[model samples]
Target: MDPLMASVAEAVRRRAQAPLDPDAELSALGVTSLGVAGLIVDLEEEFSFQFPADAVTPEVFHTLRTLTDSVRALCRHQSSMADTRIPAGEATAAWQWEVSRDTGEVHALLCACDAHQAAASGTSAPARRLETTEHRVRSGSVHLLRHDGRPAGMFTLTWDPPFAADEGAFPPAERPLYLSRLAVAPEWLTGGSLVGLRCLRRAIETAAQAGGDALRSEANPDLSATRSLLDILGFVQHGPTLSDGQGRRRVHLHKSLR
Candidate 1:
């Protein structure tokens, strides 16, 4: 609606059929291929950008709206081509979080963690595991962390988890606030310990504020960083150790929210 669109409208009107319909096809208004070619020249000069070869199609310039739309995209594409600057992330890499419920995101960090583990060797990439974990984890409250506009970490909290093979250990009120699906994007693992700790801290704060008796979490002891967080946060081992045929051992810990 501004100068760009106004000027574009003028160009369109010039070749448009009398009683011009802004939303009708230019062809319907009797605009020929020659007319369209001239309009392209006018727009390229109007915006100081070239129309992409493959993108020059009738649908893109079929109407005043569509012609204007195509010009806007050319401007963006031209700007992106000139984007060769940097902003600094090592020292200024900041992070933020919010309550999230996107099942696709849960699928993201979970599989990212899996892909990283298999990187050191040749076989564990979890190629088939991409969509495997989302269904089981999305039933709970999910929290997401974005570091410098990227998916850096995420977590989910639930009273009861779809996981936890030995559910009997917690009994009646075995810490209704359970935290799971804990992960930090592999790229940000440079600060992974810090990322993991803050997730636990936030979960604990969330639990205490919700009038919960305790916050419970399960982690594979093989993950030394995760295991160490429990020690650092004063969480106690609360249940019998659980294992899977995948050759992993897990410990469930509880920290009184009281």
Candidate 2:
């Protein structure tokens, strides 16, 4: 086995809270859903080929062995040919917000720069460099939804450079785009019928601009509503559960963007 694969098995072994089995599958162990999501993100960034929405299941990510094998195969496939997953049909909304090619002025409104909002946005200041990196990929963008004339809320989407690297994940040249972030304001939640759904649809369109066949959202488990929404929007859980800084479990929801 590759030393890196060994290291990956070890990492997953530790996180999965399951003993390592060189020839075992993840489901045989007890890795949670949240752990799987974090694993997927780490693996994607490590390898570069994003996993498809359907592949993000908890069973598939159940153990170190299963994850490593799935990643190894997927990465190889991603490298060989054009991924064929098509972006889902766009959901139309009553309001309109043009999709910008990068972070919009609205991020300044709820400017996550403030310590509280920043933390709430799920990224510590230092780790936030990824946001800028996403913006630079030129594949990510934003949708600023408006109501009556005021900016009610916004949705953001991002695609990373090809395959990233991880121990059990893929090599650096194979990871696919990592969907960075998407947010909406509480004020607009109740009144904005289909606003979010539509924005999400537009987000899918925006991701295509970055040049990939799929997108992934590392959603917090605590946010059940969002999880349900993503599932309803045609996203599927990919991988195990991920533990956030708050120690809550979350999962990764993914979609294919043509």
Candidate 3:
């Protein structure tokens, strides 16, 4: 086995708390989604390099060997100092942003968001729903922003809002777009809010160009900063506050794209 693969296999052995065959599927080896994320973070720290968001996914994580292959690829690319800029016509009109359907890309975005939330609350943010993110990615609804070739933030636009109880409320003719999971790295927010604002505006423009007539989101009521930001962006409260599954008090907000 390659050195990287051997190291990864050892980590998997410890995470699974059982002997794992290199060829066995990770899920069958008792490796949960959370466990995989922990391993990725560990590898990122150990290797002194971050894996591209596109490299993290169920296909790449299928087995110990496959995961090792991905790590090795990232290691090689990092060593070579490869560039990964968004292609022309592939970015949002106002900013150099791109949409990604890769699980790793979305995962990286979630990590940046979680890190920001942790800094704000002095506690680790809750684990993101990777399965849901992957589903949306597969549906081609995830957007990403990168700074200096590193992931800086992300947002999701889907017709099917995860928090919506009435899926039919936003009809296709209305072209309603649910804007969820917007997150920016805390580091990127420092020195000024230019980057974050630029990302939000570009996202809004992207949705509008896609025929979105309205953009919607659910925000925690206690997150005054978040609500204020949305309000400044022209979003308004659309309904009464309600408790989410995790007991967070959330209020729905929307902005007309017209």
Candidate 4:
């Protein structure tokens, strides 16, 4: 076994002399759910990254190789070097800016907004609470931004959102990155920290890096506060207000990276 697999076996707390095949079942090697739970902590410490509770899974724990890959992915995610030209932490703080598709964190941040749920917003309100989805994570579209070790904001960029089809009514572009699931922490937004501006800027930079000449997003016409930053960023109205098929009305917005 390679060094990583050996380290994984150790992390799994398998003390037996039995060998482990990279493809072999973990249970056959005497690994248990308890061991997997402990392994998450061990790998997090050893790899120097936090494991999202959602990241642990039966499929990932099926074999030594999968577990090893997951560890490497976590470390890569935590160590992403993108500099968004914003303060990641307080003055003299040790924390760093980190981005990942943490559905739980993103959902929590979105829920803090009365507009994101059905109760406070009218029945036909634009957005409903969104659950963390496998596609959002695996598609590399969703992002959760952490500043000073806390979730500051989040956004998701996609090329083929349901509204993408409406592009026919507007100028043509090969493929534009569409924004969704965007939110900033209430404290960050209200404390005058520029978190909202910087977070949206990061998302636009992300869209550019993802190989698109244009970026798209939507806002309810009533959400002047939400549109303020987008306006500052030069995102323009794309088309008339439209229904998102769920009775939620949206004002389509767009920006050209060029």
Task: Identify the candidate with maximal lDDT.
Answer: 3
Ranking by lDDT: 3, 1, 4, 2
- On a 0 to 1 TM-score scale, where does candidate 1 land against the true structure? 0.53
Runs in model 4 deviating more than 4 A are 1-95, 114-132, 162-165, 243-248
Q: What are the per-model numbers of colliding residue pairs?
A: 0, 40, 2, 0
On residues 134-238, what C-alpha lDDT tens digit does candidate 1 reach at each position?
Answer: 544444477777767677677777766635456556534644777777777777555212455556566766777778887777666666555665655667786
What TM-score would candidate 3 get against the native?
0.56
lDDT, candidate 3, 162-207, per-residue tens: 6754544332346778888887776765523344444566667778
- Tens digits of per-residue lDDT, candidate 4, 1-258, equal 678778887876552325546787676676543345445556767877765533434555767777777776666767632221121434423223455656666666776744443333354434444543456666777677665678767777787773444535445677678887777776664423444554576777778788888887767655555665576456888667777566666677778874
Q: Give the Cα lDDT of each candidate.
A: 0.63, 0.52, 0.67, 0.62
- By TM-score, the better pick of 2 and 3 is 3
TM-score of each: 0.53, 0.45, 0.56, 0.55
Winner by TM-score: 3
Q: Model 4, 131: alpha-carbon shift in Å? A: 5.0
For model 1, which pairs clash? none
Candidate structures ordered by TM-score, highest first: 3, 4, 1, 2
Q: State the lDDT of candidate 2 residue by residue for 1-258, as single tens digits.
A: 676578567556654664445666654455444444455556777788766544543334545555666677777877632232221332212244655443445554334422343355564432344455345435435556665555645655544423232332321222245554455555544421333444555566566666756666666555555565677555767556756576756565667656
List RMSD in Å for every model shown. 22.0, 14.8, 17.0, 18.9
